[PDB]
Amino acid sequence: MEPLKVEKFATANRGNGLRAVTPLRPGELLFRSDPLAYTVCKGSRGVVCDRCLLGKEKLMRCSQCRVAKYCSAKCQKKAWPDHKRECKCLKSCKPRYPPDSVRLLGRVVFKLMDGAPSESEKLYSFYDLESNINKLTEDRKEGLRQLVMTFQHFMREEIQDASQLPPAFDLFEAFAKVICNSFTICNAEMQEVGVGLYPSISLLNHSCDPNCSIVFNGPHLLLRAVRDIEVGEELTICYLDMLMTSEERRKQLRDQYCFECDCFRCQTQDKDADMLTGDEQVWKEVQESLKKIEELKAHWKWEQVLAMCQAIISSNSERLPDINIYQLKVLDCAMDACINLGLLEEALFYGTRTMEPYRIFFPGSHPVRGVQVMKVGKLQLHQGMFPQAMKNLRLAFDIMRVTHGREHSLIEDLILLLEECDANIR
Ligand SMILES: Nc1ncnc2c1ncn2[C@@H]1O[C@H](CSCC[C@H](N)C(=O)O)[C@@H](O)[C@H]1O
Ligand SMILES: [Zn+2]
Ligand SMILES: [Zn+2]
Ligand SMILES: [Zn+2]
């Protein structure tokens, strides 16, 4: 159980890209990699584990830095190679914490010296990672320049000048890689909990209608095909969240990756209309309130989320339909708030209402829908609604074994329920 399945090559115009070498079936795993470097992002920090990135109500805090919090003593140990150095820095920053991108790039710079190679850099190393120096706007260069003066500052302790780092390695150029080659680490419940750098995965170009999706069983990362992919076909993923219009997607892809998405979709404006059904006036105020809420989600702060959600869904009932992406986003948030708070009746109220949009927005098999759908069925089973629960849990499996695969332990939970939902229609 080893044979290779992808490879790099030269695109007509868009740089370096992956391709199948033999035909692929949907649900097939193609690549698998640990991070070259990864870190629990500022919000999740103090809430999740500093290694395995898992949420265990209580956490043991850092010996000498008292910032980094651990799952166990074993998690705390194999974390040394990485935490060894950074402990000192964070220690005397207190409380000011380094913006993720830095604390990451701090960790990376030593994992370059590691000597014996990494799997993460098997097909594409760090120094190959496209940075887009040319044709990068000012206020962005002026943006990255800042981070450098912040990095050097934050690091001081272990790094006083560029002579302590390998040559050809350049800091400003390195943030330019990490602005546009980072990876959002999503946990079980499809929550963002960290940022990684997977320099073989970064060989994947962008379609808003991808054929590959990636899922995070902790910091470990899986790339699978979601459809039938023929020899010589360039493999692609969507770097963005699926709840954005072509116009929102255009703006963000210029601001980060410097390009035009020339997918069949970004030209015809797929789903675009359906996304903003309702009067612009109505939801403007919702896409505004979405900038607050989304913050407090990442900071695992549910109680205020549930205030700002209830009030606003209670408000726009008479006028704004669920299928409106920004309305919907509050609905997912609404659901997510209720789950972590244990209001599982309310939880199901909100979750079931989102079910249908999701179907029209996330095509064939998307792991976001998967988990969402799972949370629904799982919410239903609990409520004792066995028939339609078996319906959704089944659906979840039809999505998830192609999105997550057998190698994901989440699947385990899924089947258990299906055999336990069997037990309640006894
Ligand atoms: N759909 C698309 N259209 C045009 N350029 C794209 C694209 N997807 C990715 N890119 C380019 O590739 C970068 C993402 S990294 C993905 C692989 C890239 N060829 C590389 O050398 O690493 C972006 O910053 C952008 O320069
Ligand atoms: Zn420490
Ligand atoms: Zn841990
Ligand atoms: Zn596009």
UniProtKB/Swiss-Prot annotation:
<dbReference type="GO" id="GO:0140954">
    <property type="term" value="F:histone H3K36 dimethyltransferase activity"/>
</dbReference>
<keyword id="KW-0479">Metal-binding</keyword>
<feature type="binding site">
    <location>
        <begin position="14"/>
        <end position="16"/>
    </location>
    <ligand>
        <name>S-adenosyl-L-methionine</name>
    </ligand>
</feature>
<dbReference type="InterPro" id="IPR050869">
    <property type="entry name" value="H3K4_H4K5_MeTrfase"/>
</dbReference>
<feature type="binding site">
    <location>
        <position position="62"/>
    </location>
    <ligand>
        <name>Zn(2+) 2</name>
    </ligand>
</feature>
<dbReference type="GO" id="GO:0014904">
    <property type="term" value="P:myotube cell development"/>
</dbReference>
<protein>
    <recommendedName>
        <fullName>Histone-lysine N-methyltransferase SMYD3</fullName>
        <ecNumber>2.1.1.354</ecNumber>
    </recommendedName>
</protein>
<dbReference type="InterPro" id="IPR002893">
    <property type="entry name" value="Znf_MYND"/>
</dbReference>
<dbReference type="GO" id="GO:0140999">
    <property type="term" value="F:histone H3K4 trimethyltransferase activity"/>
</dbReference>
<keyword id="KW-0156">Chromatin regulator</keyword>
<feature type="zinc finger region" description="MYND-type">
    <location>
        <begin position="49"/>
        <end position="87"/>
    </location>
</feature>
<dbReference type="GO" id="GO:0006334">
    <property type="term" value="P:nucleosome assembly"/>
</dbReference>
<dbReference type="InterPro" id="IPR011990">
    <property type="entry name" value="TPR-like_helical_dom_sf"/>
</dbReference>
<keyword id="KW-0963">Cytoplasm</keyword>
<dbReference type="GO" id="GO:0000978">
    <property type="term" value="F:RNA polymerase II cis-regulatory region sequence-specific DNA binding"/>
</dbReference>
<feature type="domain" description="SET">
    <location>
        <begin position="4"/>
        <end position="240"/>
    </location>
</feature>
<dbReference type="GO" id="GO:0071549">
    <property type="term" value="P:cellular response to dexamethasone stimulus"/>
</dbReference>
<feature type="binding site">
    <location>
        <position position="239"/>
    </location>
    <ligand>
        <name>S-adenosyl-L-methionine</name>
    </ligand>
</feature>
<feature type="binding site">
    <location>
        <position position="124"/>
    </location>
    <ligand>
        <name>S-adenosyl-L-methionine</name>
    </ligand>
</feature>
<dbReference type="Pfam" id="PF00856">
    <property type="entry name" value="SET"/>
</dbReference>
<keyword id="KW-0489">Methyltransferase</keyword>
<feature type="modified residue" description="Phosphothreonine">
    <location>
        <position position="22"/>
    </location>
</feature>
<feature type="binding site">
    <location>
        <position position="259"/>
    </location>
    <ligand>
        <name>S-adenosyl-L-methionine</name>
    </ligand>
</feature>
<dbReference type="InterPro" id="IPR044420">
    <property type="entry name" value="SMYD3_SET"/>
</dbReference>
<comment type="similarity">
    <text>Belongs to the class V-like SAM-binding methyltransferase superfamily. Histone-lysine methyltransferase family.</text>
</comment>
<feature type="binding site">
    <location>
        <begin position="205"/>
        <end position="206"/>
    </location>
    <ligand>
        <name>S-adenosyl-L-methionine</name>
    </ligand>
</feature>
<dbReference type="Pfam" id="PF01753">
    <property type="entry name" value="zf-MYND"/>
</dbReference>
<keyword id="KW-0007">Acetylation</keyword>
<dbReference type="GO" id="GO:0008270">
    <property type="term" value="F:zinc ion binding"/>
</dbReference>
<feature type="binding site">
    <location>
        <position position="181"/>
    </location>
    <ligand>
        <name>S-adenosyl-L-methionine</name>
    </ligand>
</feature>
<feature type="binding site">
    <location>
        <position position="71"/>
    </location>
    <ligand>
        <name>Zn(2+) 1</name>
    </ligand>
</feature>
<feature type="modified residue" description="N-acetylmethionine">
    <location>
        <position position="1"/>
    </location>
</feature>
<feature type="binding site">
    <location>
        <position position="87"/>
    </location>
    <ligand>
        <name>Zn(2+) 2</name>
    </ligand>
</feature>
<dbReference type="GO" id="GO:0045944">
    <property type="term" value="P:positive regulation of transcription by RNA polymerase II"/>
</dbReference>
<dbReference type="GO" id="GO:0005654">
    <property type="term" value="C:nucleoplasm"/>
</dbReference>
<dbReference type="GO" id="GO:0032259">
    <property type="term" value="P:methylation"/>
</dbReference>
<feature type="binding site">
    <location>
        <position position="75"/>
    </location>
    <ligand>
        <name>Zn(2+) 1</name>
    </ligand>
</feature>
<dbReference type="GO" id="GO:0140939">
    <property type="term" value="F:histone H4 methyltransferase activity"/>
</dbReference>
<dbReference type="InterPro" id="IPR046341">
    <property type="entry name" value="SET_dom_sf"/>
</dbReference>
<feature type="binding site">
    <location>
        <position position="83"/>
    </location>
    <ligand>
        <name>Zn(2+) 2</name>
    </ligand>
</feature>
<keyword id="KW-0949">S-adenosyl-L-methionine</keyword>
<dbReference type="GO" id="GO:0005829">
    <property type="term" value="C:cytosol"/>
</dbReference>
